[model samples]
Target chain A: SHCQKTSLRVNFEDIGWDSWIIAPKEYEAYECKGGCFFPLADDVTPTKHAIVQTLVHLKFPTKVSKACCVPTKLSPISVLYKDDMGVPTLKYHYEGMSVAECGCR
Target chain B: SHCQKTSLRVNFEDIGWDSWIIAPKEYEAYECKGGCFFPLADDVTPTKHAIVQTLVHLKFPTKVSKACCVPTKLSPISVLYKDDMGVPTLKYHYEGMSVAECGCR
Candidate 1:
């Protein structure tokens, strides 16, 4: 159950960005929580590269670094808000802000 | 210099993206080149984690994965192009499309 996707609801207001987001006050931004261990499941979307890195980390506990569970893919968000001049606008591709998938990194 | 930065020039026309970008016909998109091996120098900007992974891989060449030189930092690029309707537009934060820095994976 480690290195799996977890649910998270992010509210623009929580981080003081409510003033800029007029719609979708909160959304499932998701997160990559949990430790990465051996035999990474398909759900973890392990990369062959990461698998090797994890193995190395396990063998040399102190000398090498283990791959971490991190966002491997991202999704964009749409925000209907006011631009700098308080003009109503819509942003369809606010990318790299939401985790769409997870993996070992 | 086992792990280091290398230069590359990306021309929109070469990649069939010229039609999508107006200005910056070409740009410098650097790459991470060279091998990752023992005694990683400061030049590679090696992380302790990567160092450990590298050690494990060397010890078990076939069993473990070795750390790789990869992008550690990225910068944004600006593009002036036409939207769906041929409306001239400018995107200042076209990100993750180019490599700005590299390091061990």
Candidate 2:
């Protein structure tokens, strides 16, 4: 750890990455003060279906990048669905449709 | 946890105290981004000595509070003090002379 009279010079890698990724000047504004989330059935499933249809139509990859976040409700969505044997399933929904882990070795 | 469509109404007690302390509009600005600090030998020790002298001069308590921190050098202080035998003692110094700890149980 290196320190200046006004600030400390810590290694960015101490945060996670091998190198620093520049951020907006108001970067702290982007802190994940809000935790994480994933899409609800009404949102994700339908969106996925639409995406798959569009992909099939355009001959695109079926593989997708799922994005997620805490819902606008600040709560996860409660979803209900049926299984292949017609068993009911309960699912909590998230939003964004996005995400990461950070640490140092 | 209760959530509004916008912000979450988290319990203030969840933070620490039984009650929430009212703060300025820019509360995040008050975050302990600078970690902590305490008074150094040149700072704290002298300050303590002066305070004790003043207290004795004014008939006050001789007991003193020690304040410490990472020095403006961004490094701790190196103080060489004589032990009871007059042997030199090496001590790392901090600054400020003030501090605390926090977290949810």
Candidate 3:
């Protein structure tokens, strides 16, 4: 049963964006997932109803030698995951362990 | 005595440099002070026995109109401070709060 689930949460505490990332360099775009992933850390559930977003670096891990170059950007993706509550056991997502993959969750 | 004591430390914890600041920037100079300023907080003893450091932003702290303008630079100054442990009590210093005056005291 595949449903349409997509989301993300950016944790300012772990990955400080506004203060740490932003700087003199101009910004092209920004997307982040906001929230925490604690509920997902439980057992017994109808699949995980957890949500997470992806950060797509606009510049994309590059080495810009030229000036006026578009500073790196983070485009968040929308996605959500839910573990089968049928198996009440401590479970995790496919690739949603780090804030990078699952965002806040 | 105000002896010729010059030194400073760079605290990567409070002010993350390598990971936070330095990035796409080009061949630029960098300077910073490390260590904590804990001893420089009290109310007992002769001269304070604590050290702190300072942070200097070379990048004119301005908005670069052009992209190739300059990545900015940071030049750090060395210095150290030691309180007169003669008085068995607490002590403090001037302009040495938040690690920006003395260094690792």
Candidate 4:
């Protein structure tokens, strides 16, 4: 059963162990079966998997919902490395579609 | 009137226009005169003035309480530029003391 589809686009910036959550043009949605009851998985990983790992390290929320799981399929859009200063930085961008969830009913 | 003193330490990660707020070892307090009120300057700039500027541009809160103002006297602690990727990134750190507020009373 196809529950719904989500188009996700979030951004983040990190300084060592610290993280700043960016207000991305993003949102989440889900569906439940029969309005009944069942335990769904709540792990929500965005496009880049590394982001999920880092977010976990920072104690940030990496899971989305139980029933609705975002796909692991993601493609890199662009990546850049800063070199003007010491200790180079990396700018990465990627795109992907959210996991399709069906009936929780 | 020596109202009180504060020690502030905040961390932020930014990806261009987006920003994530990190849980920092930071806090703020103020004093008022005679339980009275007066208009104090609310422009609170942290260690790096650029951060203040960026926060403003992002429509984030850049001002502390008017009665209690943070000082502009901040010294850079460390700076680094990330260059391993395509788009270079900058990691900046600085330190400073809070603005001393007299009696709001």
Q: Give one clash count per candidate, in the order shown.
A: 5, 24, 42, 33
**Which tens-of-lDDT digit does each residue in B1-105 have in candidate 2?**
110011112222333322222221111100011211221223222222222222222332243111111111111223344556666566454221111221100
The fraction of reference interface contacts (C-alpha pairs within 8 A across chains A and B) present in each candidate is 0.00, 0.00, 0.02, 0.00
Q: Name the regions of candidate 1 deviating beyond 4 angstroms.
A: A1-105
Give each prediction's DockQ, rounded to 2 decimals.
Answer: 0.02, 0.01, 0.02, 0.01
Residue-wise lDDT of candidate 3 within A37-76, one digit each (tens)?
A: 2233222111111110101111221411111111112233
Per-residue lDDT of model 2, residues A10-62, tens digit only: 22233332222222111110101111122123322222212222222233224
Q: Specify the poorest-scoring 10-residue window by lDDT in model 2 chain B.
A: B24-33
Give all TM-scores, in the order shown: 0.48, 0.12, 0.12, 0.18
Quote the chain B TM-score of every prediction.
Answer: 0.82, 0.19, 0.17, 0.26
Best by DockQ: 1
iRMS values in order, in angstroms?
Answer: 14.3, 26.7, 23.0, 20.5
Q: Which 10 residues in a row give candidate 1 chain B its minimum summed lDDT?
A: B47-56
Candidate 3 falls in which docking quality class?
incorrect
After TM-score superposition, the amount by which residue A95's alpha carbon in candidate 1 deviates from its true location, in angstroms, is 28
Badly placed stretches (over 4 Å) of model 4 are: A1-105, B1-5, B13-67, B83-105
For model 2, the stretches where C-alpha displacement exceeds 4 angstroms are: A1-105, B1-74, B92-105
Candidate 2 interface RMSD value: 26.7
lDDT tens digits by residue: candidate 1, B47-76: 533443455455556744555565566677
